Amino acid sequence: GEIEFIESSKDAGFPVINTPSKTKLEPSVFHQVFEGNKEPAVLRSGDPRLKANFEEAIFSKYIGNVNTHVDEYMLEAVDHYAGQLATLDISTEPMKLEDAVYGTEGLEALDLTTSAGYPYVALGIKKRDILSKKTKDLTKLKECMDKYGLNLPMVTYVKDELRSIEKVAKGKSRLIEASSLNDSVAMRQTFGNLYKTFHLNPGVVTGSAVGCDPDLFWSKIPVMLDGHLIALDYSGYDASLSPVWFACLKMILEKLGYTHKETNYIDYLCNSHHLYRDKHYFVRGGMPSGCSGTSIFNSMINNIIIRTLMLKVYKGIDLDQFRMIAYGDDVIASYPWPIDASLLAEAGKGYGLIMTPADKGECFNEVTWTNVTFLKRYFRADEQYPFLVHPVMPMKDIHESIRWTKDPKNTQDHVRSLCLLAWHNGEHEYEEFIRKIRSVPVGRCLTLPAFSTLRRKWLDSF
Ligand code: NA
Ligand code: NA
Ligand code: NA
Ligand code: NA
């Protein structure tokens, strides 16, 4: 993706978007009990911790575009992945408005907590001023959609989240680019059934893990992924995507039965208009990170990409023996023969992607079930039930998380969430975690599940 045009918002009649510039993240009561190095991301230019220019840093992800046509390798990659999806009988019929907004099986209700986007944010109008869970009212919404229409600017916010020392210093904060409510709803109507099919079928047919529950899904992955693992990392995947990858996505959507008109929404993602504070800008390429379907579309594109690279480097490849699951940029894949990921990564560079084998800069030279991660988690087969696989979030990441809070009123929910991750590290690890939590008075005021209970509930869930 490439920023094509930027100017002061006022020159175009847009008011300044008044976004949060101070973090909601504060040190929790566990800040001193546990060790950590992470701190809230930089949210504003004047942050004293900056060792770089902030505005340049946050937009540095837009590395440019490769300007090329959909080539023979992409065409065959699209054909192959499209043939997999055809198995699922995805309906291209619009999802009815009530299902698309207030929840149906496979597609949770639209989040009332997130930004309603433009123009609502400039009018002080919130999602709850328009929608109502209790009523399932669509009257105000139909009104707003008629009045303001579709294809509105996306509002860019800086993500308020913990970051490493390096990322704070370099100012590499992430951006969330929020689709207008109108566009969110329209896209959920148009693609809602696709969304639903993907959510209900994580695995190697959708090639997707979006919506998965690692507690259950981790046991299925090694069954699905037969051979030698491939686990390339990307740097700045979303923003690196050039328009040709969006063209590939449109082709696959058309193969599934969507009309050219219904694929128009992909153009809204690719060639996008953003408002950031006092500025507005147009981007060519790049998946906006915060519109409807961004994770699913990112995953579909990753499925096309990896196939393309393998087809391009390994001319004798048999994609019918290839398996992959993606969650956005994150990929775990296998093939029955060793594949040189460094060759794939270099082929990727030719398509404007910045990729590195998972073993690069690590102490090992082969990706295995011992060292592979997916969704930040390791894989560890249970000692007693070897066919069951624990998703293993590093205790370090759990400790980083517990040391801060955006609101201490949620301490019980936050800490319980972390316990559900922590226990997979083993009974000893978990008991020490509990002890330290309980070493602050708040910790003894919390309902914390016992190790035996967590393990018993996990076993029974299968
Ligand atoms: Na874009
Ligand atoms: Na990964
Ligand atoms: Na390899
Ligand atoms: Na290495």
mmCIF file of C-alpha atoms in Angstrom, residues 151-374:
data_model
loop_
_atom_site.group_PDB
_atom_site.id
_atom_site.type_symbol
_atom_site.label_atom_id
_atom_site.label_comp_id
_atom_site.label_asym_id
_atom_site.label_seq_id
_atom_site.Cartn_x
_atom_site.Cartn_y
_atom_site.Cartn_z
ATOM 1 C CA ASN A 151 -18.252 4.618 0.842
ATOM 2 C CA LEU A 152 -17.480 7.020 3.673
ATOM 3 C CA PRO A 153 -13.990 7.903 4.977
ATOM 4 C CA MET A 154 -12.463 5.558 7.542
ATOM 5 C CA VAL A 155 -11.425 7.151 10.834
ATOM 6 C CA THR A 156 -7.847 6.315 11.887
ATOM 7 C CA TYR A 157 -7.142 5.844 15.612
ATOM 8 C CA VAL A 158 -3.845 4.935 17.240
ATOM 9 C CA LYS A 159 -4.207 1.590 19.005
ATOM 10 C CA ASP A 160 -3.965 1.911 22.799
ATOM 11 C CA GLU A 161 -2.026 -1.253 23.768
ATOM 12 C CA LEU A 162 1.226 -2.408 25.404
ATOM 13 C CA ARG A 163 4.342 -2.407 23.213
ATOM 14 C CA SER A 164 7.959 -3.510 23.508
ATOM 15 C CA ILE A 165 10.720 -1.066 24.462
ATOM 16 C CA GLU A 166 11.855 -1.039 20.818
ATOM 17 C CA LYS A 167 8.374 -0.253 19.488
ATOM 18 C CA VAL A 168 7.791 2.537 21.988
ATOM 19 C CA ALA A 169 11.157 4.118 21.148
ATOM 20 C CA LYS A 170 10.676 3.776 17.369
ATOM 21 C CA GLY A 171 7.088 5.013 17.612
ATOM 22 C CA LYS A 172 5.770 1.952 15.790
ATOM 23 C CA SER A 173 2.258 2.166 17.196
ATOM 24 C CA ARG A 174 -0.479 0.308 15.346
ATOM 25 C CA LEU A 175 -3.446 2.037 13.738
ATOM 26 C CA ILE A 176 -7.073 0.976 13.743
ATOM 27 C CA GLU A 177 -8.925 2.341 10.747
ATOM 28 C CA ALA A 178 -12.613 2.267 11.583
ATOM 29 C CA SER A 179 -15.194 1.734 8.882
ATOM 30 C CA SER A 180 -18.285 3.929 9.114
ATOM 31 C CA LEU A 181 -21.273 2.079 10.605
ATOM 32 C CA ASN A 182 -22.989 2.382 7.212
ATOM 33 C CA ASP A 183 -20.187 0.584 5.402
ATOM 34 C CA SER A 184 -19.800 -2.021 8.182
ATOM 35 C CA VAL A 185 -23.464 -2.948 7.929
ATOM 36 C CA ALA A 186 -23.498 -2.967 4.118
ATOM 37 C CA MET A 187 -20.438 -5.235 4.002
ATOM 38 C CA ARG A 188 -21.923 -7.543 6.621
ATOM 39 C CA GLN A 189 -25.076 -7.787 4.518
ATOM 40 C CA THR A 190 -23.077 -8.527 1.361
ATOM 41 C CA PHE A 191 -20.526 -10.955 2.813
ATOM 42 C CA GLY A 192 -22.263 -12.066 5.995
ATOM 43 C CA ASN A 193 -22.857 -15.622 4.824
ATOM 44 C CA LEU A 194 -19.194 -15.949 3.818
ATOM 45 C CA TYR A 195 -18.217 -14.648 7.259
ATOM 46 C CA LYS A 196 -20.539 -17.159 8.849
ATOM 47 C CA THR A 197 -19.171 -20.094 6.811
ATOM 48 C CA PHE A 198 -15.586 -19.163 7.759
ATOM 49 C CA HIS A 199 -16.418 -18.781 11.449
ATOM 50 C CA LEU A 200 -18.225 -22.157 11.528
ATOM 51 C CA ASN A 201 -15.409 -23.946 9.680
ATOM 52 C CA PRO A 202 -11.927 -23.055 10.899
ATOM 53 C CA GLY A 203 -9.445 -25.485 9.378
ATOM 54 C CA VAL A 204 -7.641 -26.449 6.169
ATOM 55 C CA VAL A 205 -10.606 -26.119 3.810
ATOM 56 C CA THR A 206 -11.289 -22.437 4.543
ATOM 57 C CA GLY A 207 -7.583 -22.107 5.248
ATOM 58 C CA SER A 208 -8.678 -19.950 8.164
ATOM 59 C CA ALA A 209 -8.519 -19.888 11.948
ATOM 60 C CA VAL A 210 -10.587 -16.712 12.339
ATOM 61 C CA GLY A 211 -13.017 -17.151 15.212
ATOM 62 C CA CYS A 212 -11.284 -20.279 16.546
ATOM 63 C CA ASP A 213 -11.053 -21.333 20.197
ATOM 64 C CA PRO A 214 -7.435 -22.392 20.712
ATOM 65 C CA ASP A 215 -8.505 -24.578 23.676
ATOM 66 C CA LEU A 216 -10.282 -26.879 21.197
ATOM 67 C CA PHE A 217 -8.678 -26.026 17.845
ATOM 68 C CA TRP A 218 -5.054 -26.707 18.855
ATOM 69 C CA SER A 219 -5.761 -30.434 19.065
ATOM 70 C CA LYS A 220 -7.071 -30.422 15.481
ATOM 71 C CA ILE A 221 -4.182 -28.548 13.855
ATOM 72 C CA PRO A 222 -1.599 -31.389 13.905
ATOM 73 C CA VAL A 223 -4.242 -33.769 12.566
ATOM 74 C CA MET A 224 -4.879 -31.348 9.676
ATOM 75 C CA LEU A 225 -1.226 -30.406 9.010
ATOM 76 C CA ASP A 226 0.437 -33.672 7.929
ATOM 77 C CA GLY A 227 4.061 -32.992 7.002
ATOM 78 C CA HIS A 228 7.018 -30.617 7.263
ATOM 79 C CA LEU A 229 5.922 -27.274 8.759
ATOM 80 C CA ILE A 230 6.099 -23.918 6.998
ATOM 81 C CA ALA A 231 5.560 -20.834 9.162
ATOM 82 C CA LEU A 232 6.769 -17.659 7.439
ATOM 83 C CA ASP A 233 6.513 -14.357 9.303
ATOM 84 C CA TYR A 234 5.549 -11.134 7.559
ATOM 85 C CA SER A 235 6.580 -7.625 8.501
ATOM 86 C CA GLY A 236 3.668 -5.176 8.095
ATOM 87 C CA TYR A 237 1.516 -7.562 6.052
ATOM 88 C CA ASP A 238 -1.685 -5.510 5.880
ATOM 89 C CA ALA A 239 -0.037 -2.291 4.761
ATOM 90 C CA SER A 240 2.316 -4.048 2.346
ATOM 91 C CA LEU A 241 -0.493 -5.540 0.225
ATOM 92 C CA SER A 242 -0.458 -4.110 -3.307
ATOM 93 C CA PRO A 243 -3.628 -3.730 -5.402
ATOM 94 C CA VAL A 244 -2.811 -6.913 -7.399
ATOM 95 C CA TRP A 245 -3.535 -9.018 -4.286
ATOM 96 C CA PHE A 246 -6.910 -7.317 -4.016
ATOM 97 C CA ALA A 247 -7.487 -8.115 -7.701
ATOM 98 C CA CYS A 248 -6.769 -11.751 -6.832
ATOM 99 C CA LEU A 249 -9.295 -11.574 -4.009
ATOM 100 C CA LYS A 250 -11.954 -10.207 -6.355
ATOM 101 C CA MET A 251 -11.319 -13.056 -8.804
ATOM 102 C CA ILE A 252 -11.768 -15.672 -6.098
ATOM 103 C CA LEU A 253 -14.944 -13.971 -4.840
ATOM 104 C CA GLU A 254 -16.297 -14.018 -8.376
ATOM 105 C CA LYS A 255 -15.543 -17.749 -8.666
ATOM 106 C CA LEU A 256 -17.676 -18.258 -5.552
ATOM 107 C CA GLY A 257 -20.582 -16.584 -7.338
ATOM 108 C CA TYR A 258 -20.407 -12.961 -6.249
ATOM 109 C CA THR A 259 -21.232 -10.493 -8.999
ATOM 110 C CA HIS A 260 -18.688 -7.895 -10.110
ATOM 111 C CA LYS A 261 -20.936 -5.358 -8.381
ATOM 112 C CA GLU A 262 -20.874 -7.271 -5.094
ATOM 113 C CA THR A 263 -17.066 -7.403 -5.269
ATOM 114 C CA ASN A 264 -16.988 -3.580 -5.544
ATOM 115 C CA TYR A 265 -16.618 -3.391 -1.770
ATOM 116 C CA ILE A 266 -13.112 -4.813 -2.096
ATOM 117 C CA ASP A 267 -12.206 -1.629 -4.023
ATOM 118 C CA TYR A 268 -13.343 0.324 -0.937
ATOM 119 C CA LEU A 269 -10.783 -1.600 1.124
ATOM 120 C CA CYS A 270 -7.972 -1.377 -1.425
ATOM 121 C CA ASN A 271 -8.296 2.233 -2.537
ATOM 122 C CA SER A 272 -9.314 3.871 0.700
ATOM 123 C CA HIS A 273 -9.921 7.306 2.192
ATOM 124 C CA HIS A 274 -8.848 8.001 5.775
ATOM 125 C CA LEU A 275 -9.231 10.776 8.361
ATOM 126 C CA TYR A 276 -6.487 10.991 10.953
ATOM 127 C CA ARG A 277 -6.837 13.807 13.483
ATOM 128 C CA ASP A 278 -6.435 17.029 11.434
ATOM 129 C CA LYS A 279 -5.461 15.331 8.168
ATOM 130 C CA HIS A 280 -7.092 13.303 5.448
ATOM 131 C CA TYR A 281 -5.411 10.952 3.018
ATOM 132 C CA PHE A 282 -5.939 8.420 0.253
ATOM 133 C CA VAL A 283 -4.155 5.055 0.237
ATOM 134 C CA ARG A 284 -3.662 2.844 -2.815
ATOM 135 C CA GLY A 285 -3.494 -0.744 -1.595
ATOM 136 C CA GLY A 286 -3.203 -1.904 2.012
ATOM 137 C CA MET A 287 -5.898 -3.758 3.945
ATOM 138 C CA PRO A 288 -7.470 -1.306 6.369
ATOM 139 C CA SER A 289 -7.106 -2.830 9.800
ATOM 140 C CA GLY A 290 -10.562 -2.239 11.301
ATOM 141 C CA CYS A 291 -13.194 -2.608 8.572
ATOM 142 C CA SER A 292 -15.766 -5.367 8.220
ATOM 143 C CA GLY A 293 -14.151 -8.652 7.221
ATOM 144 C CA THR A 294 -10.546 -7.495 7.435
ATOM 145 C CA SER A 295 -9.289 -10.641 9.217
ATOM 146 C CA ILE A 296 -11.181 -12.998 6.901
ATOM 147 C CA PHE A 297 -10.123 -11.115 3.753
ATOM 148 C CA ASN A 298 -6.549 -10.952 5.033
ATOM 149 C CA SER A 299 -6.678 -14.732 5.559
ATOM 150 C CA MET A 300 -8.101 -15.418 2.115
ATOM 151 C CA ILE A 301 -5.386 -13.287 0.555
ATOM 152 C CA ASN A 302 -2.681 -15.108 2.562
ATOM 153 C CA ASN A 303 -4.025 -18.366 1.151
ATOM 154 C CA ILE A 304 -3.580 -17.015 -2.373
ATOM 155 C CA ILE A 305 -0.134 -15.589 -1.595
ATOM 156 C CA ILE A 306 1.540 -18.706 -0.157
ATOM 157 C CA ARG A 307 0.214 -20.859 -3.012
ATOM 158 C CA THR A 308 1.522 -18.288 -5.509
ATOM 159 C CA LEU A 309 5.011 -18.321 -4.004
ATOM 160 C CA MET A 310 5.190 -22.087 -3.921
ATOM 161 C CA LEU A 311 3.920 -22.348 -7.512
ATOM 162 C CA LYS A 312 6.512 -19.776 -8.569
ATOM 163 C CA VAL A 313 9.522 -21.337 -6.842
ATOM 164 C CA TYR A 314 8.554 -25.024 -6.932
ATOM 165 C CA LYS A 315 7.221 -25.553 -10.444
ATOM 166 C CA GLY A 316 6.661 -29.248 -9.679
ATOM 167 C CA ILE A 317 4.625 -28.565 -6.540
ATOM 168 C CA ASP A 318 1.408 -30.498 -5.827
ATOM 169 C CA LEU A 319 -0.928 -28.085 -4.012
ATOM 170 C CA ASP A 320 -3.344 -30.950 -3.326
ATOM 171 C CA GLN A 321 -0.796 -32.159 -0.748
ATOM 172 C CA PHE A 322 -0.328 -28.655 0.663
ATOM 173 C CA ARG A 323 -2.265 -27.623 3.785
ATOM 174 C CA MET A 324 -2.503 -24.242 5.451
ATOM 175 C CA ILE A 325 -4.425 -22.299 8.070
ATOM 176 C CA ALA A 326 -4.174 -18.512 8.334
ATOM 177 C CA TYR A 327 -5.379 -15.884 10.756
ATOM 178 C CA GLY A 328 -4.690 -12.709 8.853
ATOM 179 C CA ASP A 329 -0.935 -12.543 8.301
ATOM 180 C CA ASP A 330 -0.310 -15.432 10.713
ATOM 181 C CA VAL A 331 0.228 -18.783 8.921
ATOM 182 C CA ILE A 332 0.924 -22.370 9.872
ATOM 183 C CA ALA A 333 1.262 -24.762 6.911
ATOM 184 C CA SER A 334 2.699 -28.105 5.853
ATOM 185 C CA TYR A 335 3.859 -30.047 2.814
ATOM 186 C CA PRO A 336 5.100 -33.656 2.714
ATOM 187 C CA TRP A 337 8.565 -32.577 1.485
ATOM 188 C CA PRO A 338 10.920 -29.932 2.913
ATOM 189 C CA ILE A 339 10.393 -26.472 1.381
ATOM 190 C CA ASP A 340 13.012 -23.722 1.514
ATOM 191 C CA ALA A 341 11.090 -20.852 3.170
ATOM 192 C CA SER A 342 13.940 -18.448 2.412
ATOM 193 C CA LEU A 343 13.204 -19.016 -1.291
ATOM 194 C CA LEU A 344 9.505 -18.315 -0.722
ATOM 195 C CA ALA A 345 10.395 -15.166 1.242
ATOM 196 C CA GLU A 346 12.569 -13.855 -1.599
ATOM 197 C CA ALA A 347 9.834 -14.625 -4.140
ATOM 198 C CA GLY A 348 7.541 -12.682 -1.804
ATOM 199 C CA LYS A 349 9.807 -9.626 -1.999
ATOM 200 C CA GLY A 350 9.192 -9.607 -5.753
ATOM 201 C CA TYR A 351 5.497 -9.183 -4.983
ATOM 202 C CA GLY A 352 6.078 -6.396 -2.452
ATOM 203 C CA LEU A 353 5.844 -8.586 0.641
ATOM 204 C CA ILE A 354 8.379 -8.511 3.489
ATOM 205 C CA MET A 355 8.746 -12.066 4.791
ATOM 206 C CA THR A 356 11.192 -14.124 6.849
ATOM 207 C CA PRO A 357 11.327 -17.870 7.658
ATOM 208 C CA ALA A 358 10.235 -18.576 11.263
ATOM 209 C CA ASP A 359 13.724 -19.855 12.166
ATOM 210 C CA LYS A 360 15.500 -16.646 11.069
ATOM 211 C CA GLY A 361 17.275 -14.945 13.965
ATOM 212 C CA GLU A 362 16.482 -17.948 16.171
ATOM 213 C CA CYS A 363 18.710 -20.604 17.766
ATOM 214 C CA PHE A 364 17.119 -23.396 15.705
ATOM 215 C CA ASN A 365 17.250 -24.036 11.936
ATOM 216 C CA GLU A 366 14.127 -26.184 11.508
ATOM 217 C CA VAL A 367 10.522 -25.279 12.372
ATOM 218 C CA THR A 368 9.028 -28.140 14.410
ATOM 219 C CA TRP A 369 6.015 -28.806 16.644
ATOM 220 C CA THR A 370 8.324 -28.002 19.578
ATOM 221 C CA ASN A 371 9.196 -24.472 18.429
ATOM 222 C CA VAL A 372 6.345 -23.394 16.133
ATOM 223 C CA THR A 373 3.874 -20.749 17.264
ATOM 224 C CA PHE A 374 0.512 -19.645 15.912
#
